[PDB]
Amino acid sequence: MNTLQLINKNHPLKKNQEPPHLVLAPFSDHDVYLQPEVAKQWERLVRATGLEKDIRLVSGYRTEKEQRRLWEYSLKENGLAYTKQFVALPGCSEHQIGLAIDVGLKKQEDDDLICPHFRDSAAADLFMQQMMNYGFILRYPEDKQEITGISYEPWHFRYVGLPHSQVITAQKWTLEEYHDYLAQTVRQF
Amino acid sequence: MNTLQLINKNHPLKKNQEPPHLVLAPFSDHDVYLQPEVAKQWERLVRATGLEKDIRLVSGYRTEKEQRRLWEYSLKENGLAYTKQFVALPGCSEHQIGLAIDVGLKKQEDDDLICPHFRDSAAADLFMQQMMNYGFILRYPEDKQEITGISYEPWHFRYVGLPHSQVITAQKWTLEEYHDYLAQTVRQF
Ligand SMILES: [Cl-]
Ligand SMILES: [Cl-]
Ligand SMILES: [Cl-]
Ligand SMILES: [Cl-]
Ligand SMILES: [Cl-]
Ligand SMILES: [Cl-]
Ligand SMILES: [Zn+2]
Ligand SMILES: [Zn+2]
């Protein structure tokens, strides 16, 4: 399990990649599964911020088959433009390795299915101040769509572990930029 | 693809069972997957009852691995006796074939993922008057625990299709009893 694995349209998962170990994650009203270290840190984060009553886990692990059904549904209902913006191609979603969480607001209702609401909120603001201290980064920041190939998603967080999440967050980097940085650095040696 | 397949502790899924066709199902606050005919009928039922803003799909298709992790989670959090009452053994859950739905109310926060709240509500009462007309039965009725081996679950519905759901519901039967009836009736010929 490499917590730093880069998964995107240019770096799809391999077909022979071993499914992640999984556990059911707490703090949701439905069954959501994550890699065990991810679930542990999610739980630690929610408890430490006192956000139990204000936020909830919306999505976690999803198989390739499921990612394809999600892509196909969004294509049919919302069209290609929206779908390309907010839904990773099957085989190219970090949800498939159990390292990604989609988080939503609790008193929030009438949610978008693909884009849960996690904006304009004191709870979200507190979450954004602490999540990096528990190994999470905001995966798809607002002005990075050319780098990530995905639109702004304030609800989507990727587990990379410490100190990576703190380094990435402090520099306002994407995971793509973090990989570029590590590659540029090793060569110096 | 028998919509009548009996899956329980005494009749676990085959190891050689075809995994089901799947589509994303509407009327949830997260991604849920079901066999296509079940999703279609679920949607028709919610629209017919006008419950789009009142009820939600809590759970649908669950892989065997996920059922194991759900079972393991409940053991840890709720203990063995409670887990055996409300969670099917891994390999013995109709959720694994995409023909079962767990239904809850939309305006609930901190709902229980094991036992979603689905009683004492106008929406639930209306759902209970119409679901049999769209192919669904209440899988685990009260006072059938000795027959089904599972405690009463007002939130859990099984798709069997028409007219079976109407026949089962009118007789206040379980799917177990329906199977015994079909077998006994075949013998009369
Ligand atoms: Cl697992
Ligand atoms: Cl699957
Ligand atoms: Cl996605
Ligand atoms: Cl039986
Ligand atoms: Cl399919
Ligand atoms: Cl179950
Ligand atoms: Zn996501
Ligand atoms: Zn269920």
Side-chain angles (χ1 to χ4, degrees):
Chain A
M1 171 214 183
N2 179 18
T3 67
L4 292 177
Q5 186 176 10
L6 175 62
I7 302 168
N8 60 23
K9 181 162 184 310
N10 294 335
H11 299 84
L13 285 166
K14 285 304 186 293
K15 287 305 184 293
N16 72 335
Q17 192 155 340
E18 347 74 5
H21 299 158
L22 295 169
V23 302
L24 191 119
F27 298 133
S28 185
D29 54 20
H30 58 281
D31 55 316
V32 178
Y33 306 85
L34 294 169
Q35 285 204 33
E37 174 176 342
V38 179
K40 177 200 177 198
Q41 293 313 323
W42 156 250
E43 184 174 9
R44 289 187 64 240
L45 168 62
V46 175
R47 290 190 202 281
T49 53
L51 285 174
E52 294 91 306
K53 298 177 191 183
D54 297 292
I55 73 180
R56 73 178 204 285
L57 182 62
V58 177
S59 200
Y61 175 73
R62 185 181 299 132
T63 62
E64 185 185 328
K65 182 176 189 181
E66 288 174 339
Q67 188 71 24
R68 177 164 294 108
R69 305 308 182 278
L70 174 65
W71 170 272
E72 291 172 347
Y73 173 87
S74 184
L75 178 59
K76 175 192 159 82
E77 291 303 298
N78 310 318
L80 185 57
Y82 182 89
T83 301
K84 282 167 111 94
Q85 280 188 260
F86 299 114
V87 184
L89 280 167
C92 302
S93 179
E94 19 172 67
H95 281 279
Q96 193 183 321
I97 59 166
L99 294 193
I101 55 178
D102 293 340
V103 179
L105 297 167
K106 258 198 175 180
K107 263 58 62 71
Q108 187 72 26
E109 206 88 38
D110 173 82
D111 236 334
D112 304 39
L113 163 69
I114 293 155
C115 302
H117 192 252
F118 202 64
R119 214 195 172 120
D120 306 328
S121 158
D125 290 346
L126 176 57
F127 190 89
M128 289 292 290
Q129 289 172 1
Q130 288 294 328
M131 88 294 172
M132 80 293 288
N133 294 330
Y134 295 87
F136 292 96
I137 59 178
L138 181 70
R139 182 57 176 92
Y140 304 118
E142 193 163 17
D143 288 290
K144 294 299 173 81
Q145 311 178 13
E146 292 299 328
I147 292 166
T148 67
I150 296 288
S151 294
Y152 180 36
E153 300 192 353
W155 60 85
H156 178 123
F157 295 87
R158 160 68 187 264
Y159 185 84
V160 289
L162 299 165
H164 313 292
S165 54
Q166 289 167 330
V167 172
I168 292 173
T169 300
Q171 302 312 302
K172 296 158 173 65
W173 276 339
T174 56
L175 187 57
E176 286 79 8
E177 289 169 292
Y178 192 54
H179 278 247
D180 285 344
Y181 151 70
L182 289 175
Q184 178 69 356
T185 302
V186 165
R187 310 194 323 203
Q188 292 187 231
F189 291 79
Chain B
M1 196 258 133
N2 185 12
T3 72
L4 285 172
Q5 189 181 354
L6 181 59
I7 303 165
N8 60 23
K9 180 186 171 193
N10 291 331
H11 299 89
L13 289 163
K14 327 158 206 162
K15 190 158 83 133
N16 65 49
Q17 181 124 12
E18 269 181 273
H21 284 312
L22 289 174
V23 72
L24 189 69
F27 300 127
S28 187
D29 53 25
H30 63 283
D31 56 313
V32 177
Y33 308 89
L34 295 171
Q35 291 203 29
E37 183 184 321
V38 183
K40 173 192 215 306
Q41 284 288 69
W42 157 252
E43 183 174 352
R44 290 186 67 237
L45 168 61
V46 172
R47 295 193 195 282
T49 54
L51 292 176
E52 297 94 335
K53 303 181 303 101
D54 300 310
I55 67 178
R56 64 185 222 281
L57 194 55
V58 183
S59 202
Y61 173 70
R62 195 178 291 131
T63 68
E64 185 187 354
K65 266 305 199 314
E66 290 177 335
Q67 185 73 19
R68 298 183 169 103
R69 299 310 179 259
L70 169 68
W71 173 274
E72 283 160 13
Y73 172 86
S74 184
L75 283 179
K76 189 163 183 41
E77 294 299 304
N78 304 309
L80 178 65
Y82 185 91
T83 300
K84 291 160 71 168
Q85 281 188 272
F86 297 115
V87 188
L89 287 164
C92 299
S93 175
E94 10 173 79
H95 283 275
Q96 290 171 235
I97 59 159
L99 295 191
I101 55 173
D102 291 338
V103 181
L105 300 179
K106 264 201 80 194
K107 287 313 194 155
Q108 205 97 11
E109 59 267 40
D110 226 4
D111 211 0
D112 180 347
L113 57 93
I114 303 292
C115 302
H117 182 247
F118 204 64
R119 290 195 80 183
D120 308 310
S121 139
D125 293 346
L126 176 52
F127 191 87
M128 288 294 291
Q129 293 174 334
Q130 290 295 329
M131 87 293 173
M132 80 292 288
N133 298 326
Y134 295 85
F136 292 93
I137 63 181
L138 180 72
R139 183 59 179 87
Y140 303 119
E142 209 171 16
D143 302 331
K144 296 288 193 174
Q145 193 284 142
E146 277 314 303
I147 290 172
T148 65
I150 297 297
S151 290
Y152 172 38
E153 306 195 344
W155 59 85
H156 184 109
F157 296 86
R158 160 71 186 262
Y159 184 81
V160 287
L162 298 164
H164 311 291
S165 59
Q166 285 165 333
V167 170
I168 289 168
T169 299
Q171 301 312 305
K172 295 179 173 185
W173 273 343
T174 53
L175 184 60
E176 284 82 4
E177 293 167 292
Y178 192 55
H179 272 252
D180 292 341
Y181 148 77
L182 289 176
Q184 165 109 288
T185 299
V186 162
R187 293 191 226 103
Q188 286 182 248
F189 295 82

